[PDB]
């Protein structure tokens, strides 16, 4: 058989195929002194196709161990779709045709991530595959919420009794919920009306949502800070916002996306970046499969 | 007329009699040409606009000793028509001639333990969120019964590429097909590996499977497992999670919201008194 080398592993091409045949059909590898040269991904990819075999029996697992299952699958999937993939510095690049090479980053639940990674994102997508072999691709986009409600500045006193906060019965129609002439308020509502918009980061973002015409209600039931209504007659909040801790793990972000998705909502992650409240929407992609 | 509650004096409205109140709102009682009401009952009527306070700091003090959560629980049941007795946050009530019922007010940040869900003879759990929304729960110890033919299994496990894999001819539902191999979860690897005591969650996994259920990741739902009871269910009836330390109440609330959301029943598992036991937590809607 003809052969090649991956890193430092020798492989033979099966069924008497030519090296140019492999290059022609799978579009990977280049010739070099009678040896077909492939990177780990390409190597594992061809092996799984039953097209190559390794001289050394321990070469398969070594490649897989070094190349990871998570990254390998991201590669395999892309290839088995049509794109041409090329890895470099933790990222995977792929172009559907002779066009723009989209960027992709495999994320693991234990992986750490800051809001800044979502803003200065030279990465177009995020890939994930769960403990069941189920892959998922998310896209990152900044949103700029555009509420439609008629907003007014609200400045009022907050009464604290029974372990909860209250406002007057004639506050902006949507703030808090009516209670015997009073207005039961959430902590964020209490901080917002009493003009304490900087009590924290959630209070600043809370204030910003309202400042831009959004009806903001608690999202604590869903694991997020609040659920946002872009309209007064929008029976269901179209957004779920969660204020992002300077640092956290990827599963919290992946989970927020599923939670939001199970109730037809968009998972939004907000923060104070470079002295401003900015929002980033994470949504699963269905056109990359 | 006169009356005292929590040491605070109150007068009836619209010149009504101390006995008019009793007859209508069926609360409190006469003592000596004076009406006696407990805190909850006093506030209940106050908001009804049927009584007033001699003082002016009584209401607030009254609403402070009685909490908001507990009052709402009381007010709701009272409006439902039930008879209510609000002890220490522990509410007893009955609708007409039916048997009495327990009701514990649970705060979203309360510390809940599995041992509680089992031992507690309380009938229902009450919660009123930060938006005034009340929700009732009921826990029932359950014993999962699946119709799946179970077969012992102890095959070797290969560990590469960061994951665990098994032979491509293992029980059809275990793991996931992957180029002839079978991608497994950490729980499946321990199962076929014979390490059922790896952790508490591995023991319930094993118990679950031992009782004919086809177990899979609850991952998508923020839960340990997804459990199918039939030989070929399209959707797992149950959602099962093993309760940690460290376990606040909002976790359960979230879990029930999640389960309901997808047609499933939220179940919490644990090794109690050296045995894997399960408890289903549901939202109750035929009350309030």
UniProtKB/Swiss-Prot annotation, chain A:
CDD domains: tRNA-intron_lyase_C (cd22363). The active site is at 229, 236, 265. HAMAP family: EndA_long (MF_01834). It catalyses: pretRNA = a 3'-half-tRNA molecule with a 5'-OH end + a 5'-half-tRNA molecule with a 2',3'-cyclic phosphate end + an intron with a 2',3'-cyclic phosphate and a 5'-hydroxyl terminus. This is tRNA-splicing endonuclease. One of its GO terms (cellular component) is cytoplasm. The keyword tRNA processing applies.
């Amino acid at each position: 058989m003809e052969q090649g080398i991956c890193g430092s592993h020798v492989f033979f091409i099966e069924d008497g195929k030519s090296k140019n045949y492999i290059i022609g059909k799978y579009k990977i590898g280049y010739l070099s002194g009678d040896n077909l040269i492939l990177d780990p991904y390409e190597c594992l990819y061809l092996y799984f196709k039953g097209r190559i075999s390794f001289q050394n029996s321990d070469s398969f697992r070594d490649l897989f161990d070094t190349v990871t299952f998570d990254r390998y699958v991201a590669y395999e999937i892309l290839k088995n779709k049509g794109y041409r993939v090329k890895e470099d510095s933790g990222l995977i690049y792929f172009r559907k045709g002779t066009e723009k090479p989209l960027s992709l980053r495999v994320m693991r639940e234990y992986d750490r991530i800051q809001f800044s990674d979502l803003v200065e994102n030279p990465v177009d997508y995020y890939f994930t595959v769960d403990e069941e072999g189920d892959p998922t691709v998310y896209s990152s986009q900044e949103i700029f919420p555009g509420g439609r409600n008629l907003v007014s500045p609200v400045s009022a006193p907050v009464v604290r009794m029974g372990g909860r906060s209250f406002g007057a019965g004639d506050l902006e129609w949507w703030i808090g919920t009516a209670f015997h002439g009073f207005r039961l308020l959430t902590e964020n509502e209490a901080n917002y009306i009493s003009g304490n918009h900087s009590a924290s980061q959630v209070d600043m973002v809370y204030s910003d949502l309202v400042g831009r015409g959004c009806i903001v209600k608690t999202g604590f039931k869903y694991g997020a800070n609040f659920r946002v209504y872009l309209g007064r007659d929008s029976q269901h909040a179209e957004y779920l916002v969660s204020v992002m801790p300077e640092e956290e793990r990827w599963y919290s972000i992946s989970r927020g996306v599923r939670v939001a998705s199970s109730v037809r909502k968009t998972m939004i992650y907000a923060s104070i970046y470079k002295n401003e409240v900015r929002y980033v929407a994470l949504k699963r992609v269905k056109d990359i499969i």
